[PDB]
Ligand binder design. Structure first.
Ligand SMILES: Cc1noc(C)c1CO
Length: 147
């Protein structure tokens, strides 16, 4: 009925239908319409104390909980979607990845090279589309597919 990984859902506050992708954790009101060898993505990573390496250029010892990191991620998603902030601006300032200095850009990549939840979300995103929170051993990501 719908593109890969989409399902209908119902808003608990408005009762209106919306669409949720269980691979990207994206959600949207409008019905989704609709794979390449390679995709190009940017990301904003928020690490937590159970990240594989709980350190980054922002903090020598990263101590925030997983729950706290998800709250930060959710707040960045809100500001990106409202247009108060740009994805790139937030990634440059607050991503716990070395790619922050490149506005979050990771370049292009194939299947097999990235951690699996990140890879699957990246390839299920359409060009220009942004993920919801994506969980990996590194932490929690917001992913933007650019190509
Ligand atoms: C937008 C934006 N994203 O990253 C940087 C750096 C800028 C400019 O303020």
């Amino acid at each position: 009925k719908l593109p890969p990984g989409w399902e209908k859902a119902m808003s608990r506050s408005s009762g209106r239908v919306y669409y949720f992708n269980h691979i990207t954790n994206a959600s949207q009101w409008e019905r989704p319409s609709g794979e390449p060898a390679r995709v190009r993505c940017s990301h904003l990573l928020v690490k937590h104390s159970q990240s594989r390496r709980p350190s980054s250029w922002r903090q020598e010892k990263i101590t925030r909980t997983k729950e706290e990191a998800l709250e930060l991620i959710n707040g960045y998603i809100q500001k990106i979607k409202s247009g108060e902030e740009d994805f790139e601006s937030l990634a440059s300032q607050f991503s716990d990845c070395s790619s922050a200095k490149a506005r979050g850009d990771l370049g292009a990549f194939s299947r097999g090279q990235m951690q699996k939840p990140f890879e699957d979300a990246s390839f299920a995103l359409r060009t220009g589309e942004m993920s919801g929170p994506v969980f990996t051993d590194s932490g929690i990501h917001i992913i933007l597919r650019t190509e």
